[PDB]
Ligand binder design. Structure first.
Ligand code: 4QM
Ligand code: RET
Ligand code: R16
Ligand code: R16
Ligand code: D12
Ligand code: D12
Ligand code: D12
Ligand code: D10
Ligand code: D10
Ligand code: D10
Ligand code: D10
Ligand code: D10
Ligand code: DD9
Ligand code: DD9
Ligand code: OCT
Ligand code: HP6
Length: 225
């Protein structure tokens, strides 16, 4: 009680460890370009650590009635994603020098995605929950589209080591971000098929992979120097 605590505790430890490791390596780096990438990327598990710790200690949970039951909704996920998702997008954009208006579009779409996601999580009419989910996923697909088609083109003008690293991070991102709306759909926020403990496990595996896994690939590469 609550049964999902073990995965909130594992997530906290894993985010804290990733932050600490990225900070130790970031601090010993001279290259001014490498340093931007370390600052942005160390912020990502640090924000996630804060939100995971809060949720562990029983903050950022509300009860939302829908489907004739009172449903536990962890809303602090969205305060995390609100800030961590555009920071990961920024990493990808700095790697390919996306231009200003593309970055603005993506961050903007990203806000709509996280914001409509949150509205959907808190909606009391069961059926409109899924309307919001659909707008959120469409915003997500706009992002994946730009990452796949737009950024890949931009990265092809870079040296092969940069384009290579971009491709790996682009793939990781497409595969991991894809899964989020499915988890939400089948989990405690949507259909209610996957109970909250398994769902928390899944979001934890996705978050650690999308933040720390992502960070380890980017930060160990030659492409940020
Ligand atoms: C007024 C008292 C409130 C306060 C002492 C309550 C509120 C939230 C509670 C923690 C979390 O549930 C997560 C863990 C669950 C495990 O089962 C036992 C340990 C664990 C860290 C808890 C300990 C403790 O019980 C806390 C801090
Ligand atoms: C560190 C966290 C990451 C990279 C999280 C990414 C989260 C998403 C891509 C979430 C997307 C969602 C939808 C596309 C629809 C329903 C609501 C969300 C927020 C789960
Ligand atoms: C039966 C009660 C067990 C209490 C253990 C509480 C510690 C949880 C926070 C520490 C995070 C790192 C430990 C890895 C998860 C077990
Ligand atoms: C310029 C022609 C417009 C074509 C519009 C395509 C819109 C639908 C895309 C939704 C899915 C994109 C996923 C990206 C692959 C990772
Ligand atoms: C304690 C966690 C610190 C991680 C943040 C480091 C990156 C922020 C740099 C801000 C601009 C110089
Ligand atoms: C250059 C095109 C700008 C597009 C702005 C964001 C699009 C969001 C997707 C639709 C969500 C309902
Ligand atoms: C990275 C965490 C390891 C994955 C855990 C395996 C799943 C079995 C647990 C079943 C739910 C209680
Ligand atoms: C290196 C870890 C930095 C994160 C500490 C922030 C704690 C604030 C909790 C509200
Ligand atoms: C149904 C999903 C709509 C996503 C829009 C993506 C358009 C790509 C810009 C050309
Ligand atoms: C070299 C590896 C490129 C493909 C990575 C795809 C794996 C997705 C992570 C789950
Ligand atoms: C796609 C992952 C689905 C796994 C969870 C379903 C099992 C629910 C336990 C009753
Ligand atoms: C999908 C999880 C990615 C794991 C990253 C760890 C590998 C770093 C060596 C390049
Ligand atoms: C919502 C701001 C859009 C800025 C214009 C540039 C779009 C390029 C993809
Ligand atoms: C961004 C468009 C808003 C659509 C709102 C529809 C909600 C149904 C109650
Ligand atoms: C639940 C989606 C599958 C996770 C694949 C990544 C594991 C490292
Ligand atoms: C404590 C194991 C991590 C190795 C990093 C280099 C010291």
């Amino acid at each position: 009680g609550r049964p999902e605590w073990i995965w909130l505790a594992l997530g906290t430890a894993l985010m804290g460890l990733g932050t600490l490791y990225f900070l130790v390596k970031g601090m010993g780096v001279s290259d001014p370009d490498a340093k931007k990438f370390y600052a942005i990327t160390t912020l990502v598990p640090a924000i996630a650590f804060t939100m995971y710790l809060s949720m562990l200690l029983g903050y950022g949970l509300t009860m939302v009635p829908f489907g004739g039951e009172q449903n536990p909704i962890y809303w602090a996920r969205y305060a995390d994603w609100l800030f961590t998702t555009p920071l990961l997008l920024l990493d990808l954009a700095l790697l390919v020098d996306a231009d200003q208006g593309t970055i603005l579009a993506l961050v903007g779409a990203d806000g709509i995605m996280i914001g409509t996601g949150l509205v959907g999580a808190l909606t009391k009419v069961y059926s409109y929950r899924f309307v919001w989910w659909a707008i959120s996923t469409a915003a997500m697909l706009y992002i994946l589209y730009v990452l796949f088609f737009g950024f890949t083109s931009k990265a092809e003008s870079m040296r092969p080591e940069v384009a290579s690293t971009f491709k790996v991070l682009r793939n990781v991102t497409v595969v991991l971000w894809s899964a989020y709306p499915v988890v939400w759909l089948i989990g405690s926020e949507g259909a209610g098929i996957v109970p909250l403990n398994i769902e928390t496990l899944l979001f934890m595996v996705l978050d650690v992979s999308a933040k720390v896994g992502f960070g380890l690939i980017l930060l160990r590469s030659r492409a940020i120097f």
